[PDB]
């Protein structure tokens, strides 16, 4: 009956491997031997996507309890009760506000038709071409997710094509291109900026005393985000034939606001701001999790968006986010994470700047598209931080730790890390179908995930060579 | 929808009752941020804040869920959580904690009942098991709606008092809809099913959220689901009878002629068979939970099999999981976030020991019926979620601090069977907000007002003295201190 389908046949395969990984030894610490079978059978579950990614999102809290993965500061393995209520508190974080804010922004614009009104401008200034349209929105991605992160960006772009995203049923080429586009495009722009995303942050937190500050730090990560984005609109407008596609002429629609608009306009600004200028309010608004109330009380409380809309929400998107969280929380606290990238250490010690870039960005790839970019990056800088240290290049360090932050953001292939690839594969026609599947975001994005990191270690850095000074 | 405003050259929407309300509830705070109030500044601070949110809350300025999302931006703002050495924590660490208190294991048990709810719903198995039941009570009108009463008690443990009450009216559809508004048998508080359901969270601790928030504070004295049906489900039942009395004797529904229900005789697929042994496993886990705590960790966690069972099987697909109401789910994370936070500021500690200082020789029955008297009037009034959230942590306090031992369970106990009570006032509740909006066919709505507040409040009463005798026995016989 239901006992020989290709879904029964991927379950008895994660089962089989995840146990004899369990089985076999495969490090000297059973906390990290089994946080490795457990990120090997939620890895394959959500690449093999046997069952629904929200719902392995759901079995990470209570494998992470079950495989006992969880450790105390001191070093010892906590106990199920303490466990339990540790990756559970720890799944809720500011990016998920961050995520209902977007959400909460997107419907605002959409429903009282200011998004029309913005996205009738620029798909007049972009054309018909159906490729020029493609670089358009990925632009606004990129250039939106350079200031307010990737966490919401996509979002908002996704409400800002909805008038072309509406009547573009799921199996027409250019709607898939579209979304996967701009999916893309938010995870290249999250190493744009310093602000760009925590693990940015915590990069130019890192780099500030090497003499790196917000220009050098634009000249460096620009430029190389700039051409990955370019290299990956080719690749798409190439291997997703969305050209020969009719296109309606856009007209841009002059009418003036009204003073609920305008209201509305007026917020989605001063949250938009305050996102921008989160590091110089963190001593008031703690982080941009609360910050991003303000958009959800002044348009939920006085009335705008019904509690119905509430309701209406993607929730598995958010699910999708908590697993993610939850995962990266168990290899952060495990300590599988570090012991891999000390063995990388003591691999490479004496070898060359570049090879040490190459091959730390090569783990971090792999690592990255599994396990959540911020978490890889919190474990690993430190580390090639300590190797450029080690080595006799004055400029080893900065050059070492600026690479690792960029390269960060590499990880791409999977359709379940990052919150940009959650929105994308989640997001559904007008008759409930899917536009992207995991196959595709698989095929059509660790290309993506190669060309980011080879614009990195030749134009970044080509540009490092000579911008960085180190001393 | 419409982009256009009213205006006056100031706008319609800002004298209003709303407007008002929030204008009260603006001023008040700022009095009491201005004025001194505690000795401490973050409890001053807390005190504020306690009195915003309650005040909203109590008040429907705002929705609920949306006053659950602004507590964590006010706890934040307010500077209210403090530090395991003492001072005022940064606002980038109290963002932290006041975001990790949100999701924790209460709201994993508030979305496994919302998964058993609805697959024992769509797959007619509650439909049925409430269907024989009906059947088995014959045609007498006592008898009948006798059985309504205590099927919805009975369904309210597993499929909650929320979507029973809907399900029992559609399975009474055929004699609700012919029947009339002039009957009295009908206008028996809609056949009782509101009584019934909003003392419907007295079955279980996934009856009501309320349940599932007071299970959490129950745990670490040793109440189990053991407590929780010994002290609960006779009660209710008592409960429940004086109920069925107060209704039948003074709607004088005897002369009535009904018809006896015909049971659903159908065979029971394999696929309905799963879910029933799939659902009784995770209610025989909740029960033995103390036993196999560890392996499993909590509740929490145990309730993340029938969702993982229940969704990765396709029985129910995405479209149900964003059809939950997440409303629910948002006030309880705000309710818990503002235990957090009142817990952390010490205002708690405080107003616990000005309480004990000022009464402390009187025994825990009267301290009960003191406590009990103001839960039964604020449920009446504020939200009875809302009520398990903010009294619960108070009374804990007050018992933990207490000098006489089981007191502190005796007391969130009591405060938490009586959560679900104060239902005489209408738009009290959705048992009582669905029972009022209820019609009879081309007549208007047949449960008047003043039938609510006549039979209700003494419905009220009738269920607070069956609780502080009963279950105040039964609860001081079976629950253990320390």
Partial sequence: KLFFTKKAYKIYFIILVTGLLLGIKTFNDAAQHRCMALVECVAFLWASEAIPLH?????????????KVLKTSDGAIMSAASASSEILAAMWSSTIMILLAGFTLGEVLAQYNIAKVLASWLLAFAGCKPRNVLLMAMCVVFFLSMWISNVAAPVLTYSLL??????????????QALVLGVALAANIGGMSSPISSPQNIISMSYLKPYGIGWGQFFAVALPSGILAMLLVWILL?????????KLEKFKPIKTKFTVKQYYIITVTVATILLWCVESQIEGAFGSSGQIAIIPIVLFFGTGLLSTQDLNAFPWSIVILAMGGIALGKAVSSSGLLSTI???????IEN????????????????????????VSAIIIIPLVQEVGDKLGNPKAAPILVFGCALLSSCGMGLASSGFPN??????????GDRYLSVMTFLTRGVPASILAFLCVITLGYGIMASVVKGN
């Fill in 341 to 347: 990238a000390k063995a990388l250490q003591k691999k």
């Fill in 351 to 374: 070898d060359g700047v570049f090879a040490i870039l190459c091959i730390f960005g090569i783990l971090m790839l792999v690592v990255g598209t599994f396990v959540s970019h911020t």
């Fill in 237 to 245: 407008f190439t291997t997703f034939k969305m050209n020969k596609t």
């Fill in 55 to 67: 719902i392995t999102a759901f079995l990470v809290p209570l494998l992470v309890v079950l495989f």
């Fill in 422 to 431: 959650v929105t994308a594969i989640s997001k559904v026609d007008r008759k």
């Fill in 162 to 175: 909805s008038p072309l995203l509406d009547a573009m049923d799921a199996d027409s080429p250019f709607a």
